Design a protein around this nucleic acid. Structure first.
Ligand SMILES: [Mg+2]
Ligand SMILES: [Mg+2]
Ligand SMILES: [Mg+2]
Ligand SMILES: [Mg+2]
Ligand SMILES: [Mg+2]
Ligand SMILES: [Mg+2]
Ligand SMILES: [Mg+2]
Ligand SMILES: [Mg+2]
Ligand SMILES: [Mg+2]
Ligand SMILES: [Mg+2]
Ligand SMILES: [Mg+2]
Ligand SMILES: [Mg+2]
Ligand SMILES: [Mg+2]
Ligand SMILES: [Mg+2]
Ligand SMILES: [Mg+2]
Ligand SMILES: [Mg+2]
Ligand SMILES: [Mg+2]
Ligand SMILES: [Mg+2]
Ligand SMILES: [Mg+2]
Ligand SMILES: [Mg+2]
Ligand SMILES: [Mg+2]
Ligand SMILES: [Mg+2]
Ligand SMILES: [Mg+2]
Ligand SMILES: [Mg+2]
Ligand SMILES: [Mg+2]
Ligand SMILES: [Mg+2]
Ligand SMILES: [Mg+2]
Ligand SMILES: [Mg+2]
Ligand SMILES: [Mg+2]
Ligand SMILES: [Mg+2]
Ligand SMILES: [Mg+2]
Ligand SMILES: [Mg+2]
Ligand SMILES: [Mg+2]
Ligand SMILES: [Mg+2]
Ligand SMILES: [Mg+2]
Ligand SMILES: [Mg+2]
Ligand SMILES: [Mg+2]
Ligand SMILES: [Mg+2]
Ligand SMILES: [Mg+2]
Ligand SMILES: [Mg+2]
Ligand SMILES: [Mg+2]
Ligand SMILES: [Mg+2]
Ligand SMILES: [Mg+2]
Ligand SMILES: [Mg+2]
Ligand SMILES: [Mg+2]
Ligand SMILES: [Mg+2]
Ligand SMILES: [Mg+2]
Ligand SMILES: [Mg+2]
Ligand SMILES: [Mg+2]
Ligand SMILES: [Mg+2]
Ligand SMILES: [Mg+2]
Ligand SMILES: [Mg+2]
Ligand SMILES: [Mg+2]
Ligand SMILES: [Mg+2]
Ligand SMILES: [Mg+2]
Ligand SMILES: [Mg+2]
Ligand SMILES: [Mg+2]
Ligand SMILES: [Mg+2]
Ligand SMILES: [Mg+2]
Ligand SMILES: [Mg+2]
Ligand SMILES: [Mg+2]
Ligand SMILES: [Zn+2]
Ligand SMILES: [Zn+2]
Lengths: 50, 91, 63, 251, 112, 77, 22
RNA sequence: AGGAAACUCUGGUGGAGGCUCGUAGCGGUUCUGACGUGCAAAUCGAUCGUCGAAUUUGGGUAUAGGGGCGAAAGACUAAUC
RNA sequence: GAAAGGUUCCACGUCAACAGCAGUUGGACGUGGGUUAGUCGAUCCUAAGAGAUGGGGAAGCUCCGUUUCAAAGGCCUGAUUUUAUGCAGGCCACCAUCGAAAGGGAAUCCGGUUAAGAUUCCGGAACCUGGAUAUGGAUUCUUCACGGUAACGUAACUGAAUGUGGAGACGUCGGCGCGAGCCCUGGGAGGAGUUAUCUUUUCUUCUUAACAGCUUAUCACCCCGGAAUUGGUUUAUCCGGAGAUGGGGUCUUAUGGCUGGAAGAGGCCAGCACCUUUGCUGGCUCCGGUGCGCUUGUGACGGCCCGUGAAAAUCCACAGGAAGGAAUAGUUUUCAUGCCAGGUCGUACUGAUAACCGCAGCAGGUCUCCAAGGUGAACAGCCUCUAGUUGAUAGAAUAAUGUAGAUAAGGGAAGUCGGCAAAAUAGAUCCGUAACUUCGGGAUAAGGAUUGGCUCUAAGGGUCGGGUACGAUCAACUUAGAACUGGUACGGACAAGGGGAAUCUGACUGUCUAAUUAAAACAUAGCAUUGCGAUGGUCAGAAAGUGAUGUUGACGCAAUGUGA
């Protein structure tokens, strides 16, 4: 909603900061196992349930 | 002209609910929607606000009375015997 | 042009009315116009002095 | 079987009385000192309608004898009380319609209302519209007055009990047919959720003792013992007799 | 034939959300939220509107002067003029009646 | 947002020690259909209100302008 | 209001008499 | 206007009703129509019921499993009774 | 816009996956930007209700209860000027808290501005609260104002405790009055369109906010006066010796008018210009009219109820008279001006045939505000203006069978379980209308006629006019009639009842098996029966110093049956 609480807006801000791909220099580290962001979230496919 | 022969105020009910019930509500609705003489100002201004509340439009007095009449016969005879017993308690 | 012809009186027969006469013009507002006219005229005549109050009262009642 | 409807009524979830539009409990003035040693005078400021009650209320204003202020008691209006009327409440009060004399100081045949059972409960008896209590007689020794209640019963209460002189206003209400489920709806809408009423014989046997069967019928006798338990008391509880009441009831 | 919108976040037609259409100097129509209308103060006895008193919301009476809230009589902004008159008459008359009751009830039992 | 109808109240107003600015606005008006005249408005910006004085005579307008204090910042438009 | 108003009134009067005391 | 009176009659005014025709709305009769691996785990179209109230409805709040709620169908209680 | 979602909003780059075809596009992918408040909300108040504490239960998790078997606290003045804040005093008895982004509630409007924000930013103009305070004004030697017969008036014109009153604060429907906006329309000043012909023509601009000053009103009230020959008066019939009509006044300022705000703004045009920031310079923005019009607000009324249609916070006033008070001086800051500050959180966007929920970019569902013109009774159906879309895999052919929509000679229900389905009827005006009836209805009963266009006629109004009958002028759509006319057509599309005679059943309106049964079932009013006078009846709870009915009291509560 537009008139929202600060707790909800803070969780929304954290989700906006988390919604990003990998920094591609991480695939260059030795003994790297991470290929992509498996915890990626889109607003059309899954809801935060908050 | 005279629009209805006998239903009177109960013509708003149409053909419903039965004639013998419409007769009772006629006899009571005439009483609760009639005007009455104010015993204080002397005018024909007393009207029912709610069941038991009879207020005068002129003098703004409000009397507790019957549900459909301003005074019931039981209240009248109680007032009479109370007056008589008050007159008797000195004698 | 249609409003001009209607003001002049065309397009008003029975084949052009789809609502009742009361729906087109209420008999209540016709009566209200009539009563206001009569009461206004009676007050004008009384305040001009062409009629007295005793005639004005019975004319008010039968109007 | 389920818990039946009259058994559910005591939990008071949706069966509480709707008390939003009520002016307060209509009680008598407290029997402090003036009412038992003399009288006190109040004034009827307004006679108002109370929701969910057939009788009108009267807002009587007294002066506090111990502090400079005004107290407002809510009486049930007796038939004939008007606004601006002076109400006299006490032992030395005069016998007039609206006064709150104790029952020891009224003669026989006095018509009173809003009568106390014990002195100090501020009105319990004869509070519905059109009802009244008659004083049958006195007992100076063993200071009790015998009274006839609206039910026809005869009680023996203290002569220090109080009562408003007259008849409760709003009488003759039930003499009018309601004519309509709508009117009954609006009547009960401000009292409580006790309307409409489904017959138990039209229910299922999980819902009522009378329910079930290929025809709508009660089955066993509808007269229930007083010693029955909750869930069974659906019918005529402890009926001494039944059927149409012919002749006088030998009251 | 312009159409307007609410200027606040309340989308409902409640009493605190009454609007009036005005025309701005920009030449457009726009809603304008109006506060609820005020009720005239009433006499304590007769319950009629007191004349001489301004009609405001209760917090606005803190901003106006004493002239807008009173008249220049006893029970000025509280009671009607006729109510003040009849209570003055009642006071004087029944205090005189109290005096004559005092002297007659004194003299009867003084004689007896 | 107020109007003043006396030149000497305007004069005692323009030296109120909180007045900083004034504005003289010229308008072309028509009193009747044959006489287009020149109206002047003297708007003093007080600390809480704007006081406007309306003059329709150019002689009184220019005499008032000469009688204006020098320390007041005026704006001609 | 009227209570904080009366208190502000008495505070102003007390400050005026206390500063004119000297 | 009539009548001796009781009172009757005529023409208006008025705008009552869990009145009525019929929108929005609410519901869901019939075609036992469409669809029936659907647009849809109940929809679509027409035909219908009702439409000033025993009306419709948002939000808040209360009642919880042998319990609740039920104008009562063993109905509903998160596609579950 | 609310809920909900949460960055989907906007820009740049971009097409591997998604957009059930495609894709250079996207609510997709990648990278960034964006939500500015003393005045809008939350915050404060209390509603239904939730819920600690004191207590009492319970082995206990915990239960009851919300003012109760409580020693339940804080408020103003000061006095003191080791001084802090005790002691001097005095008042006060509610008795936690939470609970509404739609209830209550202090205060803000206009213009402009961004890629994306605005009642928040910029400019201008205001207002409220809280706090400081000085000057002016007012008042006083008759200390705490004067005037008016009065209703009451004003720039002000002490007032503690305590008490009282008012506002906050209230249903629904009907019609009537008034106002605002819109619609319609005349003249004029501009611009645009059509122009074979016609059209002083068609379209469009001509606007004025919050706030402030003056004025402005139905109702109500005051003074004079004394009314039957009863008068005044509403659409609606109520009022008057408890003082009418009438004459003169008083008041509320919803609302409207003038002025300021404010033309400087905004709008419509013309001309001059130039890589250009791009402007600059001129004009005009005026005066009206109408109404059963639409929407909305409000007022005075009236109808309805065994229905009479929230509370608190908050603010003001009054009664009272505590205390303090002037004369060489004061006393006042509800009058004017002047100074300072106004925190925290939200603020973008969608709000749905793509941003929510339904496994999804699902024909489903999901609360509400604004609502142009014509036809027409009508926010019906149909067409158009402003605004918005032109989205849904497409192309070519036109077999059968389908789905949707139709039409059919003669017959007219022979079809079929059954007139299912479809057809017919339909609007308005006039005429006419039966049995039966609870006398209210039945009833649009049944059953007939008419309906277009054009040219006329008649009737139905307002405002001004008269020493101490009428005339002038302006403007309405309502009804009725008459010719004439036409391939007898005309509610010409749209829209829009089939009817009657009976029987069974339920009195009716209403309700239910969401997702196979809407019914004769349920309910209902009415009727009847039963229990109960409070140490009580019915019911709840593990228990309780526990509860529901009950803010109740037999015209009541509780339990049943029958169903006008
Ligand atoms: Mg004609
Ligand atoms: Mg009409
Ligand atoms: Mg009529
Ligand atoms: Mg119920
Ligand atoms: Mg029943
Ligand atoms: Mg059954
Ligand atoms: Mg059983
Ligand atoms: Mg059975
Ligand atoms: Mg059965
Ligand atoms: Mg005043
Ligand atoms: Mg005033
Ligand atoms: Mg109906
Ligand atoms: Mg209907
Ligand atoms: Mg519909
Ligand atoms: Mg369907
Ligand atoms: Mg099918
Ligand atoms: Mg198929
Ligand atoms: Mg069964
Ligand atoms: Mg289910
Ligand atoms: Mg594709
Ligand atoms: Mg592709
Ligand atoms: Mg986008
Ligand atoms: Mg608890
Ligand atoms: Mg709170
Ligand atoms: Mg709120
Ligand atoms: Mg609110
Ligand atoms: Mg409210
Ligand atoms: Mg925006
Ligand atoms: Mg600003
Ligand atoms: Mg003065
Ligand atoms: Mg009030
Ligand atoms: Mg009403
Ligand atoms: Mg203006
Ligand atoms: Mg404002
Ligand atoms: Mg008079
Ligand atoms: Mg105003
Ligand atoms: Mg509306
Ligand atoms: Mg924003
Ligand atoms: Mg926004
Ligand atoms: Mg939006
Ligand atoms: Mg919407
Ligand atoms: Mg939309
Ligand atoms: Mg979704
Ligand atoms: Mg899900
Ligand atoms: Mg609308
Ligand atoms: Mg029309
Ligand atoms: Mg339409
Ligand atoms: Mg498709
Ligand atoms: Mg054929
Ligand atoms: Mg057949
Ligand atoms: Mg056959
Ligand atoms: Mg056959
Ligand atoms: Mg057969
Ligand atoms: Mg059919
Ligand atoms: Mg028939
Ligand atoms: Mg039925
Ligand atoms: Mg079903
Ligand atoms: Mg069905
Ligand atoms: Mg039944
Ligand atoms: Mg009990
Ligand atoms: Mg029985
Ligand atoms: Zn009276
Ligand atoms: Zn009064």
């Amino acid at each position: 909603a537009a008139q929202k609480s600060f707790r909800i807006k803070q969780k929304m801000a954290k989700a906006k900061k988390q919604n990003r791909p990998l920094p591609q220099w991480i695939r260059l580290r030795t003994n790297n196992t991470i290929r992509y962001n498996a915890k990626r979230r889109n607003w059309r496919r899954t809801k935060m349930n908050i | 002209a005279k629009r209805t022969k006998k239903v009177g105020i109960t013509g708003k009910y149409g053909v419903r609910y039965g004639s013998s019930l419409r007769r009772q509500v006629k006899k009571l609705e005439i009483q609760q929607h009639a005007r009455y003489d104010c015993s204080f100002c002397g005018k024909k201004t007393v009207k029912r606000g709610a069941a038991g509340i009879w207020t005068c439009s002129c003098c703004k007095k409000t009397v507790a009375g019957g549900a459909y009449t301003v005074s019931t016969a039981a209240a009248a005879t109680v007032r009479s015997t109370i007056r008589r017993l008050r007159e008797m308690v000195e004698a | 042009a249609h409003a001009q012809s209607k003001r002049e009186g065309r397009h008003s027969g029975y084949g052009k009315r789809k609502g009742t006469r009361e729906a087109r013009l209420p008999s209540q507002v016709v009566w209200i116009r009539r009563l206001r006219v009569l009461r206004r005229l009676l007050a004008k005549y009384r305040d001009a002095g062409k009629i007295d109050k005793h005639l004005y009262h019975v004319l008010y009642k039968e109007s | 079987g389920r818990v039946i409807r009259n058994q559910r009524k005591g939990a008071g979830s949706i069966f509480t009385s709707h008390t939003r539009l009520r002016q307060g409990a209509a009680k008598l003035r407290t029997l402090d000192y003036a009412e038992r040693h003399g009288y006190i005078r109040g004034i009827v400021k307004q006679i108002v309608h109370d929701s969910g009650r057939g009788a009108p209320l009267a807002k009587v204003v007294f002066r506090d004898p111990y502090k400079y202020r005004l107290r407002e008691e809510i009486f049930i209006a007796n038939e004939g009380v008007h606004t601006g009327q002076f109400i006299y409440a006490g032992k030395k009060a005069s016998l007039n319609v609206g006064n709150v004399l104790p029952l020891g100081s009224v003669p026989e045949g006095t018509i009173v209302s809003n009568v106390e059972e014990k002195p100090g409960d501020r009105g319990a008896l004869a509070r519905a519209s059109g009802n009244y209590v008659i004083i049958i007689g006195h007992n100076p020794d063993e200071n009790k007055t015998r009274v006839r209640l609206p039910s026809g019963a005869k009680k023996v209460i203290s002569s220090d009990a109080r009562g408003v002189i007259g008849v409760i206003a709003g009488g003759g209400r039930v003499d009018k047919p309601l004519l309509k489920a709508g009117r009954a709806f609006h009547k009960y809408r401000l009292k409580r959720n006790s309307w409409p009423k489904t017959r138990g014989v039209a229910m299922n046997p999980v819902d009522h003792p009378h329910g079930g069967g290929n025809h709508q019928h009660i089955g066993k006798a509808s007269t229930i013992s007083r010693g029955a338990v909750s869930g069974q008391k659906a019918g005529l509880i402890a009926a001494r007799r039944t059927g149409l009441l012919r002749g006088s009831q030998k009251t | 034939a312009q159409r307007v919108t609410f200027r606040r976040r309340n989308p409902y037609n409640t009493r605190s959300n009454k609007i009036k259409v005005v025309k701005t100097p920009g030449g457009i129509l726009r809603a304008q939220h109006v506060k609820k209308l005020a009720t005239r103060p009433k006499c304590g006895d007769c319950g009629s509107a007191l004349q001489g008193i301004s009609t405001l919301r209760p917090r606005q009476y803190a901003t106006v002067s004493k002239t807008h809230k009173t008249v220049s009589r006893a029970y000025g902004g509280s009671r009607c003029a006729n109510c003040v008159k009849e209570r003055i008459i009642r006071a004087f008359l029944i205090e005189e009646q109290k005096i004559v009751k005092k002297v007659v009830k004194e003299q009867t039992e003084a004689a007896k | 947002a107020r109007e003043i109808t006396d030149i000497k109240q305007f004069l005692e107003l323009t030296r109120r020690a909180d007045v900083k600015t004034a504005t003289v606005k010229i308008n072309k008006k028509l009193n009747k259909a044959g006489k287009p005249f020149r109206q002047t408005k003297f708007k003093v910006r007080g600390s809480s209100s704007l006081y406007t004085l309306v003059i329709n005579d150019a002689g009184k307008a220019k005499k008032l302008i000469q009688s204006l204090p020098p320390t007041l910042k005026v704006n001609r438009l | 209001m009227r209570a904080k108003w009366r208190k502000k009134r008495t505070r102003r009067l007390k400050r005026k008499r206390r500063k004119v005391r000297a």
